[PDB]
Amino acid sequence: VALDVHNAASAWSKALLDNAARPSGAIIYKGADGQGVLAPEQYERLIFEMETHHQGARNAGRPMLLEGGLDWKPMGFSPSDMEFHETKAAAAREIALAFGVPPMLIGIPGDATYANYAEANRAFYRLTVLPLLTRVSAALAWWLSGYLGAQIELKPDLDQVPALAVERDQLWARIGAAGFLSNSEKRVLLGLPPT
Amino acid sequence: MMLNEVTAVPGTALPVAEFRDHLDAALLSYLRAAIAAIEGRTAKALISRGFRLALTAWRWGDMQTLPIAPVATVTALRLVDAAGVETPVAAGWRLVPDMARPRIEALGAMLPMIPTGGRVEIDFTAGFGASWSALPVDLAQAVFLLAAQYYELRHDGAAAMPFGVMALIERWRTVRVLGGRP
């Protein structure tokens, strides 16, 4: 449903820029009666004094003397911005909520949840990437072990992922500063071979 | 810009025999009081009388629209000096016949220049036709709906039909929307 709101609220403004009549105004010609059209000898005159002298950026403010019967009623365009704007963003944030991407990474404009991309990328590779990869590689590990004889395990390697460096450096500073235990006992806490 | 007319209408061209049927010195005194009232609202001429537009400075360099609207055959463009040596020019411009804007469009060049003091004047014969049977009939009907009012009531007294005087001359008036600089 959040896809159908974000498709349609974006196709709302696509259509509205393609089929909408705003005028800058309207030159109302009622006439001597209650109604009356103006002649083609007068309609060719009225265009040439509107095209040449009153339209464009270079004619922005001409006085437009109005005779008896003529009238200039300037039309507006009252909802100008923001046709389904905070519902299109609210739908575009509920799409990112379902797949699990945080709104910082794709660039959805919203109140900040994560701070500085060191924790937005770290939450991305921990909530919706590495749980998804540890289920696909675990089904690869069992299915491909039906082809060779020995059962095989095949799981994600967190050590070689740059998004978990903020996880990794506070680990290495935890037991690195723990000087009470020996050097061969802190290599095994990090996954290093003791020498 | 004066635009005084050269010759008035003779009165033999006015339909005083037709105005009498619609309803001679008093009838003809009421048509030309109703012809001149309709021309002044519509900026027309109705009898093809001769004019002299004597103006002091050209508004544009490929323009100076003429105010009396149905024009034909601009006779001369006399370019006088201050003492009045009166040398007419004969080339450079074109009369562009247009009921909307009767203008002098020039010939891809600035219009004839005016001497210091010597006001340029234009004489032209503007109007529909030389007789009364050459008019548009509704503008001829609007004269009779007004001149029969001046006949049938003498002072400014009291009394709107669908096509009245105003609804018939609403389509001959000059529709202008420029009160600007150019």
Residue A75 CB partners (closer than 8 Å, separation 6+): A22, A23, A24, A25, A26
Which two structure tokens, joined as six digits, stand for A172? 């290495």
Give the method used. cryo-EM
Report the alpha-carbon distance of residue B95 to residue B81 in Å, rounded: 23
Residue B180 CB partners (closer than 8 Å, separation 6+): A53, A54, A59, A62, A63, A64
Pick among A37, A53, A55 to test the B interface (most B CBs inside 10 A) = A53
CB interface of B with A, residues 149-178, below 8 Å:
162, 164, 166-167, 169-178
Q: Does B40 touch chain A (CB under 8 A)?
A: no
Report the alpha-carbon distance of residue B22 to residue A88 in Å, rounded: 74
Phi-psi category of A66—alpha, beta or left, where left has phi over 0 and alpha has psi -120 to 50? beta
What resolution in angstrom units was achieved for this structure? 3.4
Q: Which residues of A89-112 are buried (b: 16+ CB within 10 A; e: fewer)?
A: bbbbbebbeeeebbbbeeebeeee
Residue whose tokens read 């072990």: A145
CB interface of B with A, residues 57-96, below 8 Å:
none
Report the alpha-carbon distance of residue A80 to residue A75 in Å, rounded: 13
Report the alpha-carbon distance of residue B59 to residue B180 in Å, rounded: 13
Residue A190 φ then ψ, to 5°: -105, -5
